[PDB]
């Protein structure tokens, strides 16, 4: 399925993911896509910090669903 | 107050050996409140730009660091769109120590040489690290639009 990930320069990824993918899969998806290391990355959805650990079922992320990208500062 | 003592020697300092292609100096009637100028290094994107800096000096000054941003828009990795600059010595590794020329001097390092592992707007870092030429054509440009 695909989900988006907007970026705060105005980039919109779409990745395509499963359920049962975590959130460490997913920012490995995104180093794929766009070279940002998972470390550089805070993925934000309903609220919420996604943690890593947790799958996109977990937070409930269905088709086309859209997460926010921003820095992790640790990482940078 | 000691900070303002200590501004003066700096910028008396500055006065002594002024560092090429870069000045700096109070805006007008308060001390603490200076404003400095990069001129774009020659043999880099920002080549021909003059990029303005705004600085303060807290009251604990040199005790905490100076606080420093750009006020002209700049492409770089370590510097988002604010004009908020990620350099460790404006930060964790702030030291009484240094002055106002050495910071200067680190961010004229920062735009020739850049931390893109650890940077402030990651898709630049990105567009650094893995497409050089495509960072310089967008860095001359934005030089172009904001730094003339």
């Known amino acids: ?76 | 107050s000691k900070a303002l003592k200590r501004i003066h020697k700096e910028l008396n300092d500055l006065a002594r050996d002024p560092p090429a292609q870069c000045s700096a100096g109070p805006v007008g009637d308060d001390m603490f409140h200076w404003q400095a100028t990069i001129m774009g290094p020659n043999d880099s994107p920002y080549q021909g730009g003059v990029f303005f800096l705004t600085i303060h000096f807290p009251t604990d000054y040199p005790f905490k660091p100076p606080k420093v941003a750009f006020t002209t828009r700049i492409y770089h990795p370590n510097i988002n769109s604010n004009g908020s600059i990620k350099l460790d010595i404006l930060r964790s590794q702030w030291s009484p120590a240094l002055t106002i020329s050495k910071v200067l001097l680190s961010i004229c390092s920062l735009l020739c040489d850049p931390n893109p592992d650890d940077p402030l707007v990651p898709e630049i870092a990105r567009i650094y690290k893995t497409d050089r030429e495509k960072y310089n054509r967008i860095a001359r440009e934005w030089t172009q639009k904001y730094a003339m």
């Open chain 1, 1 to 76: 399925m695909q989900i988006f990930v907007k970026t705060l320069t105005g980039k919109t990824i779409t990745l395509e993911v499963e359920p049962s993918d975590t959130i460490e899969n997913v920012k490995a998806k995104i180093q794929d896509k766009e070279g940002i290391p998972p470390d550089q990355q805070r993925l934000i959805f309903a609220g919420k910090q996604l943690e890593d650990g947790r799958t996109l079922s977990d937070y409930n992320i269905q088709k086309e669903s859209t997460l926010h990208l921003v820095l992790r500062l640790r990482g940078g």
